[PDB]
Amino acid sequence: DXXXDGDGXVP
Amino acid sequence: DXXXDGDGXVP
Ligand SMILES: [Ca+2]
Ligand SMILES: [Ca+2]
Ligand SMILES: [Ca+2]
Ligand SMILES: [Cl-]
Ligand SMILES: [Cl-]
Ligand SMILES: [Cl-]
């Protein structure tokens, strides 16, 4: 995952 | 997104 927001959301 | 499977999941 990317974004530091977990799966999906921000890449 | 990527993967044709919805937000997140498969890239
Ligand atoms: Ca994310
Ligand atoms: Ca997405
Ligand atoms: Ca996906
Ligand atoms: Cl992500
Ligand atoms: Cl993502
Ligand atoms: Cl996709």
CSV table of C-alpha atoms and ligand atoms in Angstrom, one decimal:
chain,number,residue,atom,x,y,z
A,1,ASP,CA,0.0,0.0,0.0
A,2,UNK,CA,1.0,3.6,-0.6
A,3,UNK,CA,-0.1,6.9,1.0
A,4,UNK,CA,0.2,6.0,4.7
A,5,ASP,CA,-3.6,5.5,4.6
A,6,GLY,CA,-3.8,1.8,4.1
A,7,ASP,CA,-5.3,-0.1,1.2
A,8,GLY,CA,-6.6,2.0,-1.6
A,9,UNK,CA,-7.5,5.7,-1.1
A,10,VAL,CA,-4.4,7.6,-1.7
A,11,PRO,CA,-2.0,5.5,-3.8
B,1,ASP,CA,-6.2,2.5,-9.8
B,2,UNK,CA,-4.8,-0.6,-11.4
B,3,UNK,CA,-6.0,-4.2,-11.6
B,4,UNK,CA,-9.6,-3.8,-12.6
B,5,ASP,CA,-10.7,-4.8,-9.2
B,6,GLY,CA,-11.7,-1.6,-7.4
B,7,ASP,CA,-9.9,0.9,-5.3
B,8,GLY,CA,-6.8,-0.5,-3.8
B,9,UNK,CA,-6.7,-4.3,-3.8
B,10,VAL,CA,-4.6,-5.4,-6.7
B,11,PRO,CA,-2.5,-2.5,-8.0
C,1,CA,CA,-3.3,4.0,0.2
C,2,CA,CA,-7.8,4.2,-6.4
C,3,CA,CA,-7.2,-2.1,-7.8
C,4,CL,CL,-2.6,2.2,-1.5
C,5,CL,CL,-4.2,2.4,-4.2
C,6,CL,CL,-8.1,-0.5,-12.6
